[PDB]
């Protein structure tokens, strides 16, 4: 039911993207689409099926391609995830990526809350003890350190995707379906 107009998204979200751009040296490999010729990495599109970068995200905000702000968050993490996948853990570009992600995680919650959401945190806080997703880079002995996306429940009334753990509590029941605060 809630529709987000482009200028409302751009106004709220763009300062989170500028916070990334401000990071120097860290944003510099993220400022333009990876060019595997220039960078000497001819196997790049063998590994990254769905590239993403700061300029494409800015252009998506600037031209109204996101309908709702979790689509922006998903692209931010697709960019991060691509880079943590392709580059080795010891590489400069990987380490820069982790810094950008730290910066993002600290910026996104207040801004998502200004847009009516619970928070802006994509991934669960830790892996589940053992007994895809638009940001997961696709693929055509393990180690238990994967973080899955925090699952959602939609507000029945406005259509906002809210996290189950942010809005559903152990002592509250919603027989007619979840409704968010304001809306309520």
């Amino acid at each position: 039911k809630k529709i987000f107009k482009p200028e409302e998204l751009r106004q709220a979200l763009m300062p989170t993207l500028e916070a990334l751009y401000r990071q120097d040296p860290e944003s510099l490999p993220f400022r333009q689409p990876v060019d595997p010729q220039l960078l000497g990495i001819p196997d790049y599109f063998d590994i990254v099926k769905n590239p993403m970068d700061l300029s494409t995200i800015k252009r998506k905000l600037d031209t109204g391609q996101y309908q709702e702000p979790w689509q922006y968050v998903d692209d931010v993490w697709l960019m991060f995830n691509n880079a943590w996948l392709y580059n080795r853990k010891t590489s400069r570009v990987y380490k820069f990526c982790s810094k950008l992600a730290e910066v993002f995680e600290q910026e996104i919650d207040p801004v998502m809350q200004s847009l009516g959401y619970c928070c802006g945190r994509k991934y669960e806080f830790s892996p589940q003890t053992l007994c895809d997703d638009p940001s997961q880079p696709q693929t055509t002995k393990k180690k238990n350190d994967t973080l899955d996306p925090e699952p959602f429940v939609d507000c029945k009334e406005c259509g906002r995707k809210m996290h189950q753990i942010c809005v559903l509590h152990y002592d509250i029941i919603w027989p007619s379906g979840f409704v968010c605060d304001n809306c309520l």
Partner: peptide, 5 residues
């Protein structure tokens, strides 16, 4: 496997 050069 290549690396950013």
């Amino acid at each position: 496997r290549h690396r950013k050069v």
